[PDB]
Amino acid sequence: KTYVLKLYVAGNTPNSVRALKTLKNILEQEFQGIYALKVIDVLKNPQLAEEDKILATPTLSKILPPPVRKIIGDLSDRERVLIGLDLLYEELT
Amino acid sequence: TYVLKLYVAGNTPNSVRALKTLKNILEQEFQGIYALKVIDVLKNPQLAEEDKILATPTLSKILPPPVRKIIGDLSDRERVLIGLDLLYEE
């Protein structure tokens, strides 16, 4: 049973790619096995699949860890590439 | 009014033409019960508080026939449609 953190972005900028890498390592170092990360670029895969949804970053980021919330804030308020998020809690192989 | 919100990854002359038609058909058949709001995430990416994007296949089925068709076009032909929402507002 794992949390799948999904970030929906509108393209990438140099800082966003850097921020995402930082987010990845953080999850890997500080939360190994607790969060799986998935980044969906709507510029490459615009159509949401039937069971997908994009919710507002403010609402969902509230239960994420502080250092994760901070990078998400940058993707959102500074880089302006983060449209939203989805958070899943399901069994993963 | 219930606002049908269409979230798009940019526009094309064809998607823009289609969205105008959709707006007119809605106003024509439902006289104000429905309003169209287009959100271009390439322009305004951050979803605000109540904003949420649902898969087109989920909500599209409850919509007007000519509207489902255009949305099918925006989704499969233009490939600009990400998802949608229907929210009462005023």
Curated annotation (Swiss-Prot), chain A:
The keyword Protease does not apply. Changing residue 18 to A: Induces a strong decrease the interaction with KaiC. SMART domains: KaiB. Keywords: Biological rhythms. Pfam families: KaiB. It comes from the Bacteria. One of its GO terms (biological process) is circadian rhythm. InterPro entries: Circ_KaiB, KaiB-like, KaiB_domain, Thioredoxin-like_sf. CDD domains: KaiB_like. Belongs to the KaiB family. PANTHER family: CIRCADIAN CLOCK PROTEIN KAIB2, KAIB-LIKE PROTEIN 1. HAMAP family: KaiB. Key component of the KaiABC oscillator complex, which constitutes the main circadian regulator in cyanobacteria. Complex composition changes during the circadian cycle to control KaiC phosphorylation. KaiA stimulates KaiC autophosphorylation, while KaiB sequesters KaiA, leading to KaiC autodephosphorylation. Phospho-Ser-431 KaiC accumulation triggers binding of KaiB to form the KaiB(6):KaiC(6) complex, leading to changes in output regulators CikA and SasA. KaiB switches to a thioredoxin-like fold (KaiB(fs)) when bound to KaiC. A metamorphic protein which reversibly switches between an inactive tetrameric fold and a rare, thioredoxin-like monomeric fold (KaiB(fs)). KaiB(fs) binds phospho-KaiC, KaiA and CikA. KaiA and CikA compete for binding to KaiB(fs), and KaiB(fs) and SasA compete for binding to KaiC, thus the clock oscillator and output signal pathway are tightly coupled. Has 2 forms, fold switches to a thioredoxin-like fold (KaiB(fs)) when bound to KaiC. Homodimer, interacts with KaiC. The KaiABC complex composition changes during the circadian cycle to control KaiC phosphorylation. Complexes KaiC(6), KaiA(2-4):KaiC(6), KaiB(6):KaiC(6) and KaiC(6):KaiB(6):KaiA(12) are among the most important forms, many form cooperatively. Undergoes a major conformational rearrangment; in the free state forms homotetramers as a dimer of dimers. When bound to the CI domain of KaiC switches to a monomeric thioredoxin-fold (KaiB(fs)). KaiB(fs) binds CikA, leading it to dephosphorylate phospho-RpaA. This is Circadian clock oscillator protein KaiB. The lineage of its organism: Bacteria, Bacillati, Cyanobacteriota, Cyanophyceae, Nostocales.
